[PDB]
RNA sequence: UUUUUUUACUUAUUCAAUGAAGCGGGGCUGGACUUGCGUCCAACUUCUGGAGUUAAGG
């Protein structure tokens, strides 16, 4: 169960299709 | 031969010397509230003492026995809507010809699902085997089912995946399924499955179903606990 | 005993086929031949 | 069905299982907003006898008020 | 099994800090005591009002 490498401690809202 | 003009310049990442390299900071990410809430909800349910009626649901079927059950269940998956429509059309053709529905159709054999239906079957003792999903929320919908099956004498097993059971019954989610009756060639397989379920699951969980769950501490608190136990053993 | 609701759905399908609204049953071989 | 059992269990609000569930759910609802939408009723038998149906157009909203 | 006392744990709850950046347990290296190898304690920048960023390398 590998997870994403996050080089920042900030979570941003994912950009989605508009 | 290597170019003489290429030289290595090491970067010393000690305190106060160079800018720190970009490391994986996933352990320290400020997560959104829903992620944080679901993680702390799991943690709180681990930390508190769980009464036995809920803590019995931690013990589930193992992978081999679950796959052995699903080998029988996939033969008795219910009709899909397209297959049902085709059956209705073929039976309508026979009725248009004037033949009997008893002549053109036969007794079906399917896995029984739906919570009220399965509970009724258990009370009327028509159920041969009962599989109860692990993760029903709210848990009160299924928390009485093992005790009801023990009262009625029906063999039962708690199995991982309400989504897995819903995939059997062509739904998203099934809280419980029941095998009541199978065809003649699968009766030996059903009896072998019931005996294997008894010996593998029920004999193992008879001791542990009455025990209280929870009480598990976190990683750092646990490490403090072995450190104090080691200090006490040294003293 | 056969199902009464199934019998009612059969009668509705027979009425539709007699009216010609619903095309009758075709075997998979006939479907492959049409395709 | 199961809802008779849920009604008899919801009567017994001082048993160990019911108090454990009430405590963990109260912590969860305190962490959530003051008014927030519940995806499904947490008391399906009570909701069903009060008139909730699993039909499009029925919603459940969970709310906390100061006592 | 229950009634009082204090006395440990953290998950309820309370307080504080940050851009939630290096917490905890091991491993490597060095120093001490110890026992004849377990602890604790340290890794890294101090003459200068400069510069330090887009990785060098294996």
Describe this structure in words.
This is part of a larger assembly, with chains A (18 residues), B (235 residues), C (35 residues) and D (67 residues). By secondary structure, chain A is mostly loops. Chain A is flat. By secondary structure, chain B is α+β, with helices and mostly antiparallel strands. In chain B, β3 (129-133), α7 and β4 form a beta-alpha-beta unit. In chain B, α3 packs antiparallel against α9. Chain C has helices at residues 4-19, 28-34. The radius of gyration of chain C is 13 Å and the shape is flat. Chain D is mainly α and 67 residues long. Chain D contains three helices and two strands. Chain D is flat and about 30 Å long. Chain B binds chain D through residues 37, 40-41, 44-45, 48-51, 53-54, 115-117, 119-120, 138-144, 148, and chain D through 1-3, 5-6, 9-10, 16-17, 20-21, 23-24, 27-28, 31-32, 42-44. Chain B binds one RNA strand of 58 nucleotides through residues 6-21, 23, 25, 27-31, 40, 43-44, 46-48, 217-221, 223-227, 234.
Properties at a glance:
part of a larger assembly, 4 chains, C: mainly alpha, 2 helices, D: 67 residues, mainly alpha, 2 strands, 49% helix, 12% strand, RNA-binding
Structural topology:
This is part of a larger assembly, with chains A (18 residues), B (235 residues), C (35 residues) and D (67 residues).
Chain A (H helix, E strand, L loop, with lengths): L18
Chain B lengths: L32 H15 L1 E2 L1 H4 L7 H11 L7 H17 L3 H4 L7 E2 L1 H9 L5 E5 L11 H8 L3 E4 L2 H7 L7 E4 L7 H22 L4 E2 L4 H16 L1
Parallel strand pairs in B: 3-4
Antiparallel strand pairs in B: 1-6, 2-5, 3-5
Helix pairs in contact in B: 3-9
Chain C lengths: L3 H16 L8 H7 L1
Chain B binds one RNA strand of 58 nucleotides through helix 1 and helix 10.
């Amino acid at each position: 169960k590998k997870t994403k490498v996050r080089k920042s401690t900030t979570f941003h809202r994912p950009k989605t299709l508009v | 031969p290597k170019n003489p003009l290429l030289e290595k310049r090491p970067r010393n990442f000690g305190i106060g010397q160079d800018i720190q390299p970009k490391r994986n900071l996933s352990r320290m990410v400020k997560w959104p509230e829903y992620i944080r809430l679901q993680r702390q909800k799991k943690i709180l349910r681990m930390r508190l003492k769980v009464p036995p009626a809920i803590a019995q649901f931690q013990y589930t079927l193992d992978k081999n026995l679950a796959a052995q059950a699903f080998k029988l269940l996939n033969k008795y998956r219910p009709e899909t809507k397209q297959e049902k429509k085709e059956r209705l059309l073929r039976e309508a053709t026979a009725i248009k010809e004037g033949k009997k529905k008893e002549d053109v159709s036969k007794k079906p054999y399917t896995v029984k699902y739906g919570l009220n239906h399965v509970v009724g079957l258990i009370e009327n003792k028509k159920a041969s085997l009962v599989l109860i999903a692990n993760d029903v929320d709210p848990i009160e919908l299924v928390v009485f089912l093992p005790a009801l099956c023990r009262k009625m004498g029906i063999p039962y097993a708690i199995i991982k995946g309400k989504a897995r059971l819903g995939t059997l019954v062509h739904k998203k989610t099934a809280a419980v399924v029941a095998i009541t009756e199978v065809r003649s060639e699968d009766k030996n397989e059903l009896a072998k499955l019931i005996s294997a379920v008894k010996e593998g699951y029920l004999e193992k969980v008879e001791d542990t179903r009455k025990r209280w769950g929870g009480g598990i501490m976190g990683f750092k608190a646990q490490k403090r606990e072995e450190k104090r136990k080691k200090s006490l053993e040294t003293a | 005993i056969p199902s009464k609701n199934e019998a009612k759905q059969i009668m509705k399908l027979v009425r539709a086929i007699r009216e010609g609204r619903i095309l009758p049953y075709k075997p998979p071989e006939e479907r492959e031949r049409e395709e | 069905g199961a809802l008779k059992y849920l009604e008899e269990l919801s009567k017994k609000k001082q048993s160990d299982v019911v108090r454990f569930l009430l405590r963990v759910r109260c912590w969860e609802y305190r962490q959530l907003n003051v008014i927030h939408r519940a995806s499904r009723p947490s008391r399906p038998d009570k909701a069903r006898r009060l008139g909730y149906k699993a039909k499009q157009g029925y919603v459940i909203y969970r709310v906390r008020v100061r006592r």
